Write a protein that binds this ligand. Structure first.
Ligand SMILES: O=S1(=O)CC(CNc2ncnc3[nH]c4cc(F)ccc4c23)C1
Length: 167
């Protein structure tokens, strides 16, 4: 039993809700919140900008130190950093950005990072400003993630389309 509330169950392990991931994280305080990161961990907009703003820029400060030490992530890769006031940990995952020409096949590799964590609160990778089709992203999620994933979808209209079209 966990504290996630109001989710629709899609599969054995995947759940979905119309919610603001920032507000969902603030209430649940999950072990892991997933950030829709880029390779530079520059949290300027989309989910990343919203999560970082909620941390009063502490996420960005921590991220800049991470990059200065380790260099950029790979597209399809991830790192675990602090969850600050939102979660115990933040898993920064880089899905391909279609608006930069990155290969969509890397979306499966990106979701594989979720399997290293038993339970996660996450957005749909490569959705929103990353330019992928969220219906495709949901399909890859369901077919790749085996751990328990609670997906927050900010836009009510998209949430309803994702549910109604789910196979
Ligand atoms: O429905 S979409 O097209 C948009 C969604 C991807 N982004 C998000 N996903 C879940 N929670 C979110 N909270 C936010 C707050 C913000 F300021 C900006 C973005 C998000 C966001 C696929």
């Amino acid at each position: 039993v966990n504290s996630f509330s109001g989710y629709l169950k899609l599969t054995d392990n995947v759940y979905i809700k119309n919610a603001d991931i920032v507000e969902e994280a603030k209430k649940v305080k999950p072990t892991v919140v997933v950030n829709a990161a880029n390779v530079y961990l520059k949290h300027g907009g989309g989910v990343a900008g919203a999560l970082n703003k909620a941390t009063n820029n502490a996420m960005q400060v921590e991220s800049d130190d991470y990059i200065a030490t380790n260099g950029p992530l790979k597209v399809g890769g991830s790192c675990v950093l602090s969850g600050h006031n939102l979660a115990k940990h933040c898993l920064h995952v880089v899905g391909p950005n279609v608006n930069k020409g990155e290969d969509i096949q890397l979306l499966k590799s990106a979701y594989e990072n979720f399997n290293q964590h038993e339970v996660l609160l996450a957005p749909l990778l490569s959705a929103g400003i990353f330019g992928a089709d969220p219906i495709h992203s949901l399909r890859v999620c369901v077919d790749t993630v085996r751990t328990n994933v609670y997906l927050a979808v900010f836009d009510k209209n998209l949430y309803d389309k994702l549910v109604s079209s789910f196979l």
